[PDB]
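Re: your question from the hallway

Yes, I did run it. Sequences:
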Amino acid sequence: TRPANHRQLTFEEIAKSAKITVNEVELLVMKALSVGLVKGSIDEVDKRVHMTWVQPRVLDLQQIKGMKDRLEFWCTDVKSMEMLVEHQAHDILT
Amino acid sequence: DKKFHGILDQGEGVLIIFDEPPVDKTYEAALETIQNMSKVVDSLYNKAKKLT
Amino acid sequence: EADGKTAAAAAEHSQRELDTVTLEDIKVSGKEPRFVLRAL
Amino acid sequence: STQNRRALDLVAAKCYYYHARVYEFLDKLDVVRSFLHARLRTATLRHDADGQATLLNLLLRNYLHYSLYDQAEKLVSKSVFPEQANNNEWARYLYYTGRIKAIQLEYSEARRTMTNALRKAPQHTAVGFKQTVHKLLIVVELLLGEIPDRLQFRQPSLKRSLMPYFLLTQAVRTGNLAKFNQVLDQFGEKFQADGTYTLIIRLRHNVIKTGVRMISLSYSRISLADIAQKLQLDSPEDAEFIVAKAIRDGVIEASINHEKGYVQSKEMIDIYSTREPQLAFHQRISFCLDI
Amino acid sequence: QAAELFLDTVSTFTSYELMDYKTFVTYTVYVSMIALERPDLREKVIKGAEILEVLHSLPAVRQYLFSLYECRYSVFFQSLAVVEQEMKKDWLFAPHYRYYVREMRIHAYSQLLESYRSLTLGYMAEAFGVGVEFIDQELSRFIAAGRLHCKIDKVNEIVETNRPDSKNWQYQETIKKGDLLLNRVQKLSRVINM
Amino acid sequence: VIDAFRLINANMMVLGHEPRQTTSNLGHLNKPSIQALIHGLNRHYYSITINYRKNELEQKMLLNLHKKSWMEGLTLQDYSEHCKHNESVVKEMLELAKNYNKAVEEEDKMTPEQLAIKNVGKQDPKRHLEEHVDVLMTSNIVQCLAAMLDTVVFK
Amino acid sequence: MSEKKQPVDLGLLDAHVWEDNWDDDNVEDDFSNQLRAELEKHGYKMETS
Amino acid sequence: AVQKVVVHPLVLLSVVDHFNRIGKVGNQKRVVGVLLGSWQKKVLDVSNSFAVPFDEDDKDDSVWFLDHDYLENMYGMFKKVNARERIVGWYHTGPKLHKNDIAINELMKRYCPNSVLVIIDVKPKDLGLPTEAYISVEEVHDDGTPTSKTFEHVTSEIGAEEAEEVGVEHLLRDIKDTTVGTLSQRITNQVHGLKGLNSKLLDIRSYLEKVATGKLPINHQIIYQLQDVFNLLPDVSLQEFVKAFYLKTNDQMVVVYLASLIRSVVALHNLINNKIANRDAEKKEG
Amino acid sequence: MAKYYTRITMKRMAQLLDLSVDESEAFLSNLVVNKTIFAKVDRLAGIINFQRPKDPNNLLNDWSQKLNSLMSLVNKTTHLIAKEEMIHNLQ
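Structure:
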């Protein structure tokens, strides 16, 4: 769910969202890691975890419009960046 | 005696230990190439200033 | 060399003028009559 | 124009100098300055080299012989033309602008420009204006809160002339007004003869400034119940004010906790990680490629 | 150079100018104790037995050396005062009998202020020589001189080491020497090429 | 090195007839080598000029024949190892500077060509000094530029 | 070349052959004229307390 | 099996000659042929080739003709003049894959159990590389779809031989090249990089249109892969990564400064030599 | 736990090992002096700190690695695109 900017979260959030007591949550996430469906690390001294990669999932015909949207203006950035270096150094070799 | 490196604190008796950083290169070497060619420039004048 | 040649290389003449200025400061009655007697 | 290349390449340039000297030698200077203004104006149009260097220096010279405004000219002057100079005239132009900057209560950036002036003089034996520029440099650096340098006081060429200035700074460092008065009442004739008396007549306040600056560099966390105690200042209320002003103009970086009564100075380190060294290096790269 | 040349002590014939070989020994130990750092002082003039044999007849100088080496600063000043008074009434050393003291003091401080990083000042009240404010003012006047780099705080009466690092410095000297040479080359190009 | 020949006539050439007709400069552009003259080319046969005439499509190929994939261009060199190379060359500069000072000091002390003639064994430090530039440059420039670009084009 | 012509003038014209090699100016300034008897500076400080 | 394949120029010129010649026998838009080669340590080397008659009725799959006992006859005729080389695979000059070529491959595989396909597109319309390499495999499925027989990609490159690059270079009198050193770096590894990356992103861009009801989502597989792409790309250049970057930029430029300084001093030295030599000889010859 | 965790307190360790804190310390001491486990316990606050070496040159090694993987993956997607579009839109 969370945007890629964060994908970092505290014990309390999971503990409530899965309605399991906090002292269990460590083992839960360890299980998650061990079966190999999610990757990252745990930072117990402040009760936080970081989760850098997650199993792909199917998704619907409207969510992919988000993919096309992101990809389009990623694409334009490349052309923009090319114009600059192709121009300013024209005299070395155009 | 720098046999074992770290640091000491008197406030409460704590022996902080850390790994010493390297002392660099391509800086120590440059810092005397500069000197060497300064001497070169000085010696340029024995046949630059006088001969002209 | 300054006017016979392209009028930019009177720099050697310039330095000559610097040298002559310094020297003449440390350098005459007969030189002046002669000098003056140049006709051109 | 026809022989302007040669005629103004030299001969004219030095002529103006000697003709001006005559007048200074045993005469007035005024219609000379009017003539100089006119002759500068006729340059800057047909020609733009050495006709804008010798005239600028001479004109500013005679302005400074008296004590006029002397600044409204530099701003629009266009500066002594770069790209060409004899590197000699650059020296005295820098000296002039340095002085006119120092007298108008602009200290911090005067020292750097006049030091740049000094480093451009030749290796020649003449100590004509080297003594002058050194003397001015010492006196501006006794402002702010520094120490001039314990060298350039013993070198053979210049020593007799700097004697009173050493004897002055030897007092200012300890910071005891007694001896400072005993020096001034003794050599005031010399100083006013030097044409620099008024700068040193205001020096006592920068005396106290230098004292507090060295204190700032010594400690980090210190109570006001000692700053005035060890500076012979009896009141600890005005110590707040002198310290605050010193903070305002950038002498020391500390802050003050008015209720608490301690002064602490912040420490800012790790200048290697910032972008500024890249800039300092890029400038030199550009210069070397230019050479 | 004096401590660099007095290393011999093994070929010094019974020369006339230093009538006493013992005087030659005392002089060389005096200069060596200041010219060089801890690694060699621990290697050469303390692990050489000719000088040790000589010193065996010289209680005062031997005590003065071992005081510094073993960090018993309490007696270090006890010895340094006496060596100072012996320094004053001696020829070819009196002209700067003060200078020596003003040096050794500073060096002894750098002996101790290196091990710690947050030493309290009261620790020097009893361990280094009595007098708190005395240490206060000497430290204050020495810090501003650009040597003995540290920083003190009177409120809680504490000292902080203030370690510098091998990169800011290794950058500053680079930039200043570069500027100096660059000025040189600019001028030296200027005189040439008209 | 290619050549193409055809036999001269089976003599009956005492007539002094030329083997060929000429109505152009077009055949006399080239100098026959000594070797073929030794074996007698103009005595028994004659040479004919070779020419190439590439068509459009093959020459379009022939330039591609060295192109290398986009995958590589954006790739960075390792930063470690790179630093190692920098320190290697910088420490190699010293000896050349030291030698250069003497080489400056001693010249014009003897006749001019007797500089070079006496410098066939030992190297001349100018060139070796100069050609260690164009290794600090080029390398550092291109690495810093490539990193500086791709820091933008990906996220 | 090194003209150095100068309207500014020379201006002016020892018992100091004691050249201590170099400097000492900051050093002599440090102990300008006081805190002299360092022996007494210690001694009459250990009896103080 | 195979890890990489290497092609010699003689093959590429052969392909092009065949493509231009066919006009004397048909009107087709593709041609097909055999690759002779050898290999060792899973590195395959193709060296020579000959072309065999082929034909296809464009308007349908499954109706095509390929002449066995001409292939066998030529292979015999070649073997008699070079024993080094053996059937290895086949090539065709179409710009894109075709439906039936898996059914070509299952034929010609009877001549070599490992056979590899090389597409040699003869009319490029971009900056690029003229060859692609494919090998045949069987795919399982998680959807329970039956086992599928399908191609797989293999990395490729051009190679060279000293006896040929002399000829290639004798012939490469066409245009400029070799703008030495710093000139060639930035062109060859910045501009012609970015142009490629842009073309790839345009291709993905186009495909994600057809999924607007133009075509069925080919698999959740392709979507899982795309999600990996947009997840992996480097973290926002916003954290203490920045500090680590500045450090190296300083170190990278400092040595440049040094080298530039060296560069200037030599010019001054050369200047002086030119100056004195001139004036002296002048006064002398006067 | 060193394989999974990054930083961990004293008491959580003692609780998971079902033994006193002192025995935990003594037990891991000969482990770390054996060059078997890379740990750096800090007693004052009791925060064990596995796998925290840190480097200022490694960082952008990792960065360059991620870049290489991303370029390769974008390369590989297009082959799949092409061959799949082949079985639907040829005609």
